[PDB]
Amino acid sequence: YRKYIEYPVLQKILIGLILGAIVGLILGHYGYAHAVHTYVKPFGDLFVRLLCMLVMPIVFASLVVGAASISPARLGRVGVKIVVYYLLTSAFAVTLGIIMARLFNPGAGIHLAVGGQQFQPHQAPPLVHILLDIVPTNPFGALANGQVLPTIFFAIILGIAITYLMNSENEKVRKSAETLLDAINGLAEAMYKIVNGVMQYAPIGVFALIAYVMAEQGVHVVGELAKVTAAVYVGLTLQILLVYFVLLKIYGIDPISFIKHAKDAMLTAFVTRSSSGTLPVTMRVAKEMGISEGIYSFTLPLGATINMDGTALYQGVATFFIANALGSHLTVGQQLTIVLTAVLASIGTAGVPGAGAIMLCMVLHSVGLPLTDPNVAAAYAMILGIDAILDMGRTMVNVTGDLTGTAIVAKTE
Amino acid sequence: YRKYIEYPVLQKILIGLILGAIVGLILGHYGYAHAVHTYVKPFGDLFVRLLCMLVMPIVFASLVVGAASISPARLGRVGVKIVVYYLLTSAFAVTLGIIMARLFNPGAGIHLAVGGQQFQPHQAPPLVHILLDIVPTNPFGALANGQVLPTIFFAIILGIAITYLMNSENEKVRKSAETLLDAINGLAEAMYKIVNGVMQYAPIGVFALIAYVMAEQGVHVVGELAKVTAAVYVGLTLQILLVYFVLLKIYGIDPISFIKHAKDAMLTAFVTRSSSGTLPVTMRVAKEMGISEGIYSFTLPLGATINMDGTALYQGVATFFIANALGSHLTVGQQLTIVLTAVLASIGTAGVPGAGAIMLCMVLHSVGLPLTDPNVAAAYAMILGIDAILDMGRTMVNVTGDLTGTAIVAKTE
Amino acid sequence: YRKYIEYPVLQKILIGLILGAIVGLILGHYGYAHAVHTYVKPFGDLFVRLLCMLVMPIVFASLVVGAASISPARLGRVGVKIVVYYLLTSAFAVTLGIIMARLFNPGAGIHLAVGGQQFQPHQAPPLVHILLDIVPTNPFGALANGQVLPTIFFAIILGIAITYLMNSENEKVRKSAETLLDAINGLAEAMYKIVNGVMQYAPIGVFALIAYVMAEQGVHVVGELAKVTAAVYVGLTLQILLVYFVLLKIYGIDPISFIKHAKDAMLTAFVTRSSSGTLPVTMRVAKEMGISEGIYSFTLPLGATINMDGTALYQGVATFFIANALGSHLTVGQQLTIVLTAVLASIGTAGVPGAGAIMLCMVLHSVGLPLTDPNVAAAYAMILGIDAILDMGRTMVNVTGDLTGTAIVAKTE
Ligand SMILES: N[C@H](C(=O)O)[C@H](OCc1cccc(NC(=O)c2ccc(C(F)(F)F)cc2)c1)C(=O)O
Ligand SMILES: N[C@H](C(=O)O)[C@H](OCc1cccc(NC(=O)c2ccc(C(F)(F)F)cc2)c1)C(=O)O
Ligand SMILES: N[C@H](C(=O)O)[C@H](OCc1cccc(NC(=O)c2ccc(C(F)(F)F)cc2)c1)C(=O)O
């Protein structure tokens, strides 16, 4: 038990994935699939329930504290320019991922049905009726139901009001707003501690999900996930080439001479799989150019937490894979809802220890595909089974997206 | 932007109403109504959504803090007599407004249908089953749904318990109740700051609502709102005459000699449209009679915030206009629910900057006519279009209702 | 009024029961039953609504504070052994009560229908799908609905995280978790103050419930409640004999010589009807054996609040009486849900002044039989009418269950 807890959790969940896939494949080939479905699948359904539990208090409390922490006069002009750049590039990354998932059609041809029936889709409202459904009718009724976008707006609009209250001239209202912000900060840190136990449970439920799904389907899923990782990587290299080379050549920096210097810390992201564990390495390559200290001392720790581009592209491709494996058809209107949710999920869940799972949970909730439906969990398990090589490429772009961002700011200043 | 914010908000929303009505009328006459319905109406639906958002946390937090602030031994006998008088006169004002809205039948003959279908009414429970539905089955489930009356009771019953906790002999429970009351006070003041931004947005959404509705209907609405303002003003003068002259002649004060002295500050309410901006003016006329300082130094600032009579009558007439324009039929049982909600809305939302809109929102929620249904918003926009002259008469009675109230207390003491 | 409040509340509600039963019987015999059903029953429906109101914030706030208060290193090994013993014996008591309620079939043959239709049962999920429904999908949506078991888990898992937060090394997170725990403690004590007013209202609503039910049915209910109290008492003596004599003879203590010393304070529980008002009496009989001071100074005040065995058996018999009078059929899966809820209700609602009513309300909510359905309230009133003699026997076993528990711990240590 204690020897199992002290193991590092990322290699733990990776070796759980690897031990799950092969064992599920041989149990699916030998014919013991029904025993797996009756005895192992509740250990994975418990894990997807524990993952759906944590997504609602985090997206309220963390967003309230984060919106209360900002100050546009204290945060300099360099800060607001790099925030504009990060949100614009993340929106373009989700748009390009949706484009490269419509061009490839991954998952089309599975016809997944777990219980014996297909996933019945919900009627999507028109385009105008969703931007009016951003603002909640009832702010308690948006938290009592799922409603990720009607509670992000309420959390941000509460945090800005708490900021306007905290610097007021009266004393009792300052004490009251201070105690309210401290209570919501306590709820946020309690959620951050529950996440660090659910992630310890994760290398059992993930093994259960893979050993269920690969025993159910088995053979065709490796072709479908090969098409998935091809549609991720060609759009990922197209993301780097198009977006970063245009945004570097429009400001006069030679992109080949930039990237041939940046490669020394770009390549360690491909083998480290952590955009924060390579921060002292990329500090050296930010020092290697002519960037002043007051820019790269501040921007790259912000870019390692807010600026996530490859994760933003993968959150479009792996949310079209679910809808194309479930037989649903995502119309326009809930197609830009993926963009508006994947940008604000990166700006919201900054610094959570479980960002990679709840950042997809709150997009699949916002589309209308909840993870408790048994058709969604199977395709989600296929995505988590292929997730390792995609995480390699995701970190590879997630580190480059900051070195191409501080150079633009150092060019204008 | 900054020049638009620094404008005073009441003249802003009034000139938005006036610029909305004429422009909507000429667009409705020239035949460009469908372009208005497809391009301008979301700016009004956004505003009615922003108005329905704010009504649930205010009616909980403000009521909790207000019920926690009272003390029946610190508040003197003069205070409890004037609270009994204010609530009795407000209940009689809602009853007389319901009478003068049944006698005139305003809005009967419109047959409003926006989407292409009429408003389907809900089955009203009997009389006994509503007074048992005052107390909530689930206090969290009353806030997660609308349920204005099952959350007013819970907020008051929580505030009284916090008052009984704060003066306890143990120390940890006193610290705990103090931090809880400070957190709910912080939520209340954060809602009061969000109201002051939604009211800044209001002179665009109000213009959108009027430019939609007057372009849809156009001609017959001026006759319907003329019947509405006639049914307001004849019941308003009957309110003054019957209620105030009987309650003044029963205690021996000559009402003609009283009102001929009170006219000097009664008439400025007709041209000021603010029952709080005429408080130093009516302090002079309270001084002009033989009222001692210890009564009129305290009562008139309480009467300008709690005692609202013309607003209570208008919240009966303009809630029968909605039900008679929508084809519904308000039975008895949800007819005294309007009385019990309009009294406790005046006692609850005391000091909010958005009292005039949420005080009608939480009555239309309590009847069963929510403002997100597109049939309700059109007739609500007709009421807001006629609202200016009614606000003049409402302030005219709202100021007189305190000068007739302190004289009774000065007569018994 | 003041002379009515200063009366002690337990003798008040008992004399309300006794004055209710006879008066309801003679009104049912003389033929004035419809006047009772139309004029008295809302006073009982108001009371069952006030009892259903209080069960949701208590089971969240009290559980959060109680789970935050524990420390397994500060609480000694004697403490964790006696907690294991108390929870094991309470689970065995609920199991034996369910056995002695299946063996007797109480309430089978009533065919109760108040409104004119029977109680429609809900479809029970299978056994695996309930242990996965323990963990909530949405922690706010578990509190917005009833969902007692999906909010007990969330309250415990929040309290443990607040405990792990409070001893952290950073200072701001310690301040934040301290203010959050103080706010939830304030909510818990506010609920404990509202309970002490609802219990003051209780000797009117209880009289209304009995005077309604005994006027409706009248004659056959005395045979049904005689079978109920027989099925309670034979299982209660079988509980004492089997469980306590096996758990005493397995550790070498002579049970006859133990109970002949323990009788001097066991017999006062039969006439006192209070397991806490006999605590100084049973301290003497704990001193009368060879128990050291460091065990019985700590354990018996814990056993009078956590260890409830006869109440645990009665919460199985009086929850099979409701399901057998309503025509429903409790399957296995919602039969061990009664065990898992009645154990955790004893561990949760420890120290509340209204434990005996909400501890059954949160079991009938967890089965799927809410107390607002008019078929459930009649059989619940039959249980409350017979409740006095059952409370005598319940206290008789509830006191013995601690004297048989400290002796085992004094034997191992
Ligand atoms: N690739 C980036 C970067 O590792 O820095 C990017 O970072 C986001 C990030 C940061 C810290 C933790 C996480 N969480 C995970 O990796 C994760 C992975 C799998 C699960 C699972 F339990 F399997 F669902 C849960 C969480 C994600 C990413 O992984 O998408
Ligand atoms: N007539 C009284 C007195 O002005 O003092 C009485 O005061 C209540 C009062 C006080 C302060 C602000 C408000 N709010 C408004 O006037 C208001 C008017 C229109 C809207 C709109 F946005 F159009 F819905 C919103 C709010 C109301 C009343 O207006 O009904
Ligand atoms: N018999 C035990 C012991 O009296 O100590 C055991 O104690 C639990 C306990 C302790 C303190 C108060 C309570 N509450 C009640 O007795 C009670 C009885 C009836 C009602 C009613 F209002 F009639 F529903 C409400 C509450 C229960 C029990 O009564 O079940």
Numbering used by the authors:
A (entry chain B), B (entry chain A), C (entry chain C): 4 to 416
What does the paper say about this structure?
In the GltPhIFS-TFB-TBOA structure, TFB-TBOA density was well resolved, and we modeled the inhibitor in its binding site. However, TFB-TBOA assumes a different rotomer, leading to a displacement of the backbone carboxylate and the loss of coordination by the highly conserved N401. The aromatic rings of TFB-TBOA protrude from the ligand-binding site and lodge in between the transport and scaffold domains. Most strikingly, HP2 takes a wide-open conformation that is essentially the same as in the outward-facing GltPh-TBOA complex. However, the bulk of the transport domain swung out away from HP2 and the scaffold to different extents with the largest angle between the transport domain and the membrane normal of ~ 47° in GltPhIFS-TFB-TBOA. A consequence of these differences is that the bulky residues in the HP2 N-terminal arm, L339, L343, L347, and I350 make more extensive interactions with the scaffold TMs 4a and 4 c in GltPhIFS-Na and GltPhIFS-TFB-TBOA compared to other structures. In GltPhIFS-TFB-TBOA and GltPhIFS-Apo-open structures, the transport domain leans away from the scaffold far enough to open a window between the two domains that connects the interior of the bilayer to the solvent-filled crevice on the cytoplasmic side of the transporter. We observe excess densities in the opening, suggesting that lipids enter the space at a position structurally symmetric to LipidOut (LipidWindow). In an extreme case of GltPhIFS-TFB-TBOA structure, the membrane bends outward, particularly when viewed from the cytoplasmic side. It is unclear whether the nanodisc restricts how far the transport domains swing in the GltPhIFS-TFB-TBOA structure.
